[PDB]
């Protein structure tokens, strides 16, 4: 029954963001720790995303893109769209349509340096850590910032696994 309301989680997250900003005036630290907790969630979250689909780690990067894409539909019940691949064809752009945590939560223009929902941008980080595929991942257009629809840019950097599943570590 989805056992949650988008509003409910939105309230919890907004209150938490309020809490950090009340803790540290500088948005730099709130961004740091929010990406830290995004990493933290993304490590355990993949343990459930792989509890349903037993996809092989990475045959190709488009497989990773579709995996992370379906992840949000599993959790946040939104379908992102993958596009804008390089001639190198390793990176990509990913579109989040509607963000439950965002829904009518305005941000102070005196707080612009904050990356509000970057937890997801870090969750995939924490996710991509686990499968031994670290990634330079972040946003190029933010529906939060005033852009039309959310758009995160994924630059994969390097692998951590050999012909054995154990891989380098």
């Amino acid at each position: 029954a989805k056992k949650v309301n988008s509003e409910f989680l939105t309230l919890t997250y907004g209150a938490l963001v309020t809490q950090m900003l009340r803790d540290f005036e500088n948005a730099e630290d709130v961004n740091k720790q929010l990406e830290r907790i995004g990493y933290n969630m993304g490590m355990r979250l993949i343990e459930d995303f792989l509890a349903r689909t037993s996809a092989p780690r990475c045959l190709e990067m488009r497989e990773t893109a579709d995996r992370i894409q379906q992840a949000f539909r599993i959790y946040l019940n939104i379908q992102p769209t993958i596009s804008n691949w390089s001639p190198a064809s390793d990176e990509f752009s990913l579109v989040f349509d509607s963000n439950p945590l965002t829904e009518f939560v305005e941000l102070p223009p005196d707080l612009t340096n904050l990356r509000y929902s970057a937890i997801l941008s870090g969750c995939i980080r924490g996710a991509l850590e686990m499968v031994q595929l670290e990634v330079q991942c972040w946003f190029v257009q933010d529906q939060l910032k005033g852009d039309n629809v959310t758009e995160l840019r994924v630059k994969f950097v390097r692998r951590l696994e050999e012909v054995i599943p154990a891989g380098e570590d």
Binding site: I37, M43, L50, A51, R57, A166, D169
Partner: protein, 219 residues
């Protein structure tokens, strides 16, 4: 039928969670006579038998308590040596009480520590290419199922030889692992599991797996 020892190990391999099912280790009793057919060979505080196995006695089987006197190391609780009573024939016949040395917690920790690189280095240059480490081991009296979550976590549960569909049990313990690690980020990703919630829900799982039927996946 039961899942003997449900365990799990970190990337380093320290046994995270020694979930022991109820496992009655066999206890043997016998009233012996003048110096023994049994090989009462002393080996590092383990007064056991290597040769001359009788009456369902194994190599591990070690004296626990003659006439209900538990052994401390090699000596009697009253302070006499095992062989001190062995040379003495007046008390004979005397009741010896043998049990296989029950793996304590630190023992199982060392066992998992010594095991881990085995699976980790499991024929790294195996004849077949692109292969994995050991996925299933099958032994004389048990079968170990190890399941790597493609990185990090290794669910290692040992079940009966003839048991089937253990992979689904691994799936459910994967689920309950997630349901636990929900709560404590201060629970480090390599700290041992100490939580009674996981304990009781896995006791429910054991009660279920008393029944073979796993459906709506049974927990």
């Amino acid at each position: 039928m039961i899942i003997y020892g449900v365990y799990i190990v970190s990337k380093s391999g320290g046994l995270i969670f020694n979930l022991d099912n109820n496992v009655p280790r066999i206890e043997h009793e016998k009233t012996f006579t003048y110096p023994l057919d049994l090989v009462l060979d002393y080996d590092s505080k383990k007064v056991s038998v290597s040769f001359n196995r009788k009456d369902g006695i194994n190599v591990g089987h070690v004296l626990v308590a003659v006439n209900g006197m538990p052994v401390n190391g090699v000596t009697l609780d009253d302070g006499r040596d095992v062989r001190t009573t062995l040379d003495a024939p007046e008390n004979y016949p005397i009741n010896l009480k043998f049990s296989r040395p029950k793996m304590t917690t630190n023992e199982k920790i060392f066992l998992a520590s010594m095991f881990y690189p085995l699976f980790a280095i499991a024929s790294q240059l195996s004849p077949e290419p692109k292969s994995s480490g050991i996925e299933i081991l099958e032994a004389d009296t048990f079968t170990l199922h190890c399941f790597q979550t493609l990185t990090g976590i290794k669910f290692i549960i040992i079940s009966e030889t003839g048991l089937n569909g253990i992979d689904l049990l691994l799936r459910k313990v994967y689920e309950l692992y997630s349901d636990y690690v929900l709560k404590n980020p201060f629970y480090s990703l390599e700290m041992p599991i100490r939580c009674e919630l996981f304990d009781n829900k896995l006791q429910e799982l054991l009660a279920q797996v008393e029944k073979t039927g796993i459906s709506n996946i049974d927990k």
